[PDB]
Amino acid sequence: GLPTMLTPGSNQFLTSDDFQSPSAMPQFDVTPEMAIPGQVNNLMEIAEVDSVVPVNNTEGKVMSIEAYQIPVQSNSTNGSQVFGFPLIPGASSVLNRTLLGEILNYYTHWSGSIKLTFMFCGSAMATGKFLLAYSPPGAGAPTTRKEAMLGTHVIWDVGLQSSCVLCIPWISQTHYRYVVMDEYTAGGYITCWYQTNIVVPADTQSDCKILCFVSACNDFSVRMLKDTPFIKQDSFFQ
Amino acid sequence: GLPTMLTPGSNQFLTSDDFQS
Amino acid sequence: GLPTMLTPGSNQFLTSDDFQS
Amino acid sequence: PSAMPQFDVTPEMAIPGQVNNLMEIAEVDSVVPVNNTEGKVMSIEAYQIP
Amino acid sequence: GAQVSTQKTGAHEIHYTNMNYYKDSASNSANRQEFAQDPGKFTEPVKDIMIKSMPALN
Amino acid sequence: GAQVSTQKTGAHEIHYTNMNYYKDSASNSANRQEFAQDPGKFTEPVKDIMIKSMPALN
Amino acid sequence: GAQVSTQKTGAHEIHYTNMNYYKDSASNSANRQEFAQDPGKFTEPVKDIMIKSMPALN
Amino acid sequence: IARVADTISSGPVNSESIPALTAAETGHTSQVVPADTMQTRHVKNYHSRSESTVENFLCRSACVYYTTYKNHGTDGDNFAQWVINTRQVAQLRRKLEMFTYARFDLELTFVITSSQEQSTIKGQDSPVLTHQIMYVPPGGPVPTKINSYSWQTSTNPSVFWTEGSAPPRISIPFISIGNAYSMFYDGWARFDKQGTYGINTLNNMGTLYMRHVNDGSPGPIVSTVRIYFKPKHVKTWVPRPPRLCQYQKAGNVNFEPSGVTEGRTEITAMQT
Amino acid sequence: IARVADTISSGPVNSESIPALTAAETGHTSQVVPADTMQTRHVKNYHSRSESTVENFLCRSACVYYTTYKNHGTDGDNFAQWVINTRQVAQLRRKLEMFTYARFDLELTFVITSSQEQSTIKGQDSPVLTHQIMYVPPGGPVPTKINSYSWQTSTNPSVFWTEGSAPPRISIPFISIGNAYSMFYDGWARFDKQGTYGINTLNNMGTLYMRHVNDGSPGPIVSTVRIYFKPKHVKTWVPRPPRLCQYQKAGNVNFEPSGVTEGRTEITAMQT
Amino acid sequence: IARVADTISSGPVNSESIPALTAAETGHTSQVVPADTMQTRHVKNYHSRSESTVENFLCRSACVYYTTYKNHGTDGDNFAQWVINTRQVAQLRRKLEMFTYARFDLELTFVITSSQEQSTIKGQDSPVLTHQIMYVPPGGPVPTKINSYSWQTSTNPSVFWTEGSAPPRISIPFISIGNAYSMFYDGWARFDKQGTYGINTLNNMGTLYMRHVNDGSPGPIVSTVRIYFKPKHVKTWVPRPPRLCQYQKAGNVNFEPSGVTEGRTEITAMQT
Amino acid sequence: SDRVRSITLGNSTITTQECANVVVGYGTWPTYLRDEEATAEDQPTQPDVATCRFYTLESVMWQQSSPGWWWKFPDALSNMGLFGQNMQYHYLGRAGYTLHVQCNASKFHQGCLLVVCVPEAEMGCATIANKPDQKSLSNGETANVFDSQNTSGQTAVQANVINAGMGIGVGNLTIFPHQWINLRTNNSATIVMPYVNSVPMDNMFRHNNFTLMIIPFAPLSYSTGATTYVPITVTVAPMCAEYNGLRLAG
Ligand SMILES: CCCCCCCCCCCCCCCC(=O)O
Ligand SMILES: CCCCCCCCCCCCCCCC(=O)O
Ligand SMILES: CCCCCCCCCCCCCCCC(=O)O
């Protein structure tokens, strides 16, 4: 027979490999394919589909539908804050369980731009304007509209079109950021401030809600697979 | 001799297989 | 090195065979 | 075998100072601690020839 | 009768061979590759085409 | 001096090689294949041919 | 689909083959070779070129 | 290849085009990219999306199940058995349930280990153990004893293995009745809807049986076998929302009501 | 290839053709297909018949027989022997008996295991055992003792094997006297019909002998060897009805009268 | 190829050329060779510089770290863990720190050994041990117990290995966030410079977890695992002065002030 | 403009003046089975206009406090005229569906609902060691109602809205074909759902291909004096229906 030598690594079982192996059932006839709609070739086809963000994470609202609503109202003062959170897709309570978060939770590193869609759900007779803004790291989150406006931003005019999109550009010293919270790959902050008041006519409710949806941009990827900390068991399920 | 590495499944007896002998 | 798998019959001594040595 | 099949490796960039061989370092000079008087070893004086 | 294809490499800085040893396609190693993507079936499942630069309504 | 043939695959969605290492044909692996069938010797062992659409008698 | 290259030999007194068995370039053995050297970036990092035979100053 | 879209330079804009506004109500995502909102530079983005492919996501060998058996026992009751069920394992089940339908081949690996039981016996030196794993399809003969004729295995596939060798490995081709395996089943086994309800109505994938093939020795031994699953050549359809509730049962989707996210002090708080 | 016949669309029929009626008495089956009885749609049936081929049916390694031997005993009586006989095993025999005649090569695999016997001996640590399997054709020298010269094996084929290695394997070419092996034999060994009757008159396939090739050690050991058979390149002729009675003997076809089916409450009952 | 420069014959010189004098202050080395100072003969120097290449310097498998675990313990606390850190080892760290930046793939090899603990137990004969090494990337589930579900390993890569086989081996592709691994970091994790300072701010490379996959046996065993690192395909930039001080910490570059050379009696002494 | 649409099927037409663009499956328009993808050999029944017409399901009222509603389709339409009879008389069948969900209100009313069609929407039971009752899962055209809080009972469906009845976040249901009715934007939404399964045809009583869920993410709100009765109504039509296996009716 042919002289051979075994290298290190022989007879080891790697859970992440590619080898050929014998079939348990030689010449097995496999049932034919059919054109099932909805074929997924890549997880980014899912990451690019939006979901609604549980922004209102008041501790008492977590098990309510209210988690998805951002409250807004008529204000007696200008420049008040509507909402805010840090940009940490794989950790923050705002994004970690959204579809983008759920996919990222199976990866260690990630990169790419992100979209946030804001849909006004107030009456048709209600109008107003908002500041949607992103503030890169190196300063803390803005404490006033005046500061928030110095970052990347969109003025959202609520009118006939109900939705507005804030695109968060990729800004990093790195090609990839950590999925997990990390000080080096700091996310920066996303906030929203009123631009103008919400103005309604008589016999109209000024109190109204806005829904926020999140998805990946066409320029988006991940680096390596990890298990996810969102699931646990004590023993086998029965 | 030629460097080789053994994969999982070495030295196993499968009742349903095809090998030469 | 080249991935390989050992079949049944490895390391056996048959009194009736043909191999090089 | 790779631990991570089909792994996407972060692209290269042109970092200055690439070293291909240690002789590229051996051919660069340094100052010789000639004055090795025992009491001058931890001083800058080690590099001076009086 | 091996096929020859490429290894995944890093971008912006190679072949390997692959022979099948079994009579059953189920014995082949995983079909890892770049493939292709078509997210539109999930991100734009709409009969009437929207134009990115245009108002969605009217 | 290996031969190249195909793997069984599923219908309505590949080659492998085979070299013999022994001087005796008894050493070859099983001749698994689609072959052919001819059930007529057991299902229609009749001298006078029957026509499917016709009466069997007369 | 193996490549053929040479072995290192002593100077002033041969080929070997190399096939890749993996789909990932990280699986390849080390890129040992003579390469090339360019020490000038560390030994002569100077805008104005010095001539070996000439005075350094003036 | 599978390269991420690159970035096109974008200068100042003053026009009637409105990429910033849309109608989420229509059921499609916005296609807006940074070039539409801020001035940009050209970026030759060389990143790929290979790890996001379905095949890479799923092709890892997961522990699915393990059980035990002993080399001593009562009336031949020294074998383990396990009904094939991929829903008994939390991590693999979660990944698989992301797609409603899937079609794949499955590669199996077994890891077999053993240990000594507490005993008062001296002279426990024993020969290397060999194990038999047999698969019995639905309706096959069933072992009732380790020495039953049911272990002859004239047709049923099986694997024999000796400790110290590399762990056993084998390939199983796609075997569904239909054209894909279903992860979910919103229906009943029976037409009168009197049988069980849900996914377990389709689970008729056979059982594995395991035993030692040595004879007994005075020194008691307990063995454990871990069964690993690695789907290959996987095509999937119809993605689903990942589960938030923890799994309770392998036979169904019953759940403990669960919130959608960890809470925080306020809607403007940075500390999540 | 070996594709199942497909289905041709079939519209309404009103004619003198009578595919529905025949004469079973003639000894042939009806060739009627669904297109002849009901209106049909075209169906491109892509199913194959590969697992139904004879080769796939038979090419599995079945346990045929097993026996034991010890490393201690009286006057050299420490070897096992077995007359080749494929009729001692119920499952394999049943499959093989489906064809009256068959011609095939046979691949053998052996599985060798061992265990400790109860003993009062301390210091039983022992070296790895090696086993010898020898085949003695009819009329060869026979072992009477484990240390007999009959084990020199100058011509008779044999296999030596050490525990921990992969199980032994070997190929046996077709060896019949005739052009096929007979599964049945309706006849006698002798012209006066005074010898035995039936299939055992043809069974003169030799005997296997097995022993340890180590010397004895104070710690008693009992070993078991399982012999597996996998027919290859199998051509068969003249199919037979499968047996309903359980087998009683390896040397004949004697049987316990047995019914043709499990009964039920009535001829119209759905509960069988 | 990579041949050393050869020597050109050189006769007497009397001229205005001054290869002997220069200006070190300018920051470049002299290019003077022997042909410029003394009369020379031609020398066909056939020596190469292959071992000086960076790849050869670094591509050796160094022990980086080792730890231990036992087959008995309290409340499942029988596993070892190690944070990846290449700075805990003096020899490898020194070699790696010669370059400020480097880009390479890493090949790992593990060496697993074990021994017996002092015990009063008789009957310690045990089956061969199998070990599991698992890698958990930052943010993954973490084992808290040897029997935790965290060891299911549905995605996280892991290796299972049985003693007596060749030591485990695996390839890790370059994985940095940036385009090179930094050996040094003159900076802080935070913008307010209130976190840690130095290289450890970038070390977020995950943790290895290790355990036996057998069950426990009465005879106590302690196991040791040595982890070896062999960089491959290594490209480096910006060489640095080698360290003279001995290392104190793996997390920083703190040092004990150290002299530049061993002393001697005088500046003209031959006895150094 | 693009806000107005009209759909004609069989003997029924729905005309809408304020609507969203039509959502279509996974990009697949419903069709009849091909010869390439077939099981049953008998010539199929194709009722065409007899069953492909629209049917209206029982309307519900939208309260400012409502948690939401759902329907299972093969069951919802079991008594719907001839669609109903053809499934009652056959072992196998197949159809796609057009789902048009309507809810008008004055410009002065506000609120917003998700209209989503979910395949294989298998339900979890409120009692963990149990299975849900048939009536807890479907009441034909009568909608089942989601709970605002955790519910209970041995055969009850764990209807708490936040988990969508299946243990997932409600906010992630947007994966499935869906459309929204935002009272300030439109009065109706249309979803086209092709048949989706592991098999070409199936039994229309044992299995529910998909469930329609109507979920108010933003509750109905209005000023006093405004209309208090704001209904939601659902109209559906099967497409390309096919039946096989004619038998004694169930
Ligand atoms: C003893 C060696 C042979 C082993 C044969 C075991 C075959 C068991 C079946 C494995 C496939 C199970 C696929 C279930 C997927 C699903 O329904 O979601
Ligand atoms: C020790 C190694 C050599 C083993 C040689 C054993 C050969 C025994 C004969 C096997 C063929 C028996 C075929 C019987 C078939 C039949 O009659 O129906
Ligand atoms: C259990 C098998 C998989 C093992 C995976 C271990 C991967 C750990 C990361 C190794 C690369 C560390 C590189 C550090 C170099 C540096 O920063 O200077």
Residue numbers in the entry:
A (entry chain C): 1 to 238
B (entry chain C), C (entry chain C): 1 to 21
D (entry chain C): 22 to 71
E (entry chain D), F (entry chain D), G (entry chain D): 2 to 14, 25 to 69
H (entry chain A), I (entry chain A), J (entry chain A): 11 to 282
K (entry chain B): 10 to 259
Quoted from the paper:
Enteroviruses are nonenveloped positive single-stranded (ss) RNA viruses and are major causative agents of waterborne diseases. Coxsackievirus B5 (CVB5) is a genotype of the Enterovirus genus, which is frequently detected in clinical and wastewater surveillance. Here, we employed a reverse genetic system for CVB5 and assessed how different amino acid substitutions in capsid proteins affects the virus’ sensitivity to free chlorine and heat. To elucidate the mechanism behind reduced heat sensitivity of the CVB5F.cas.genogroupB mutant, we subjected it to analysis by cryoEM.
We applied a combination of 2D and 3D classification steps in cryoSPARC package to separate the particles corresponding to mature virions (F), intermediate-altered state (A), and empty viral capsids (E). The resulting EM density maps were at 3.6, 2.7, and 2.6 Å global resolution for the capsid-corresponding part of particles F, A, and E, respectively, thus allowing building of atomic models of each state. Surprisingly, only ∼0.2% of the total data set corresponded to mature virions in the F state (193 particles). We believe this to be a result of formaldehyde inactivation. Nevertheless, the reconstructed atomic model closely matched the previously published CVB5 structure based on genogroup A (and a previous study64). The root-mean-square deviation (RMSD) of Cα positions between the two structures was 0.45 Å. This is consistent with the fact that most mutations were relatively conservative (L → I, E → D, S → T, K → R) and unlikely to induce major structural rearrangements. None of the mutations were located at the interfaces of multiple protomers (each comprising a single copy of VP1–4). Amino acids at this position make direct contact with the noncovalently bound palmitate residue (i.e., the pocket factor). While we noticed somewhat weaker density for the pocket factor compared to the previously published cryoEM map of CVB5 F-particle (EMD-3032164), the switch from M to I does not alter the size of the hydrophobic pocket, and these two amino acids are commonly found at position 180 across the Enterovirus genus relevant to human infection, including 112 exemplar strains of each genotype of Enterovirus A, B, C, and D, listed in Virus Metadata Resource.
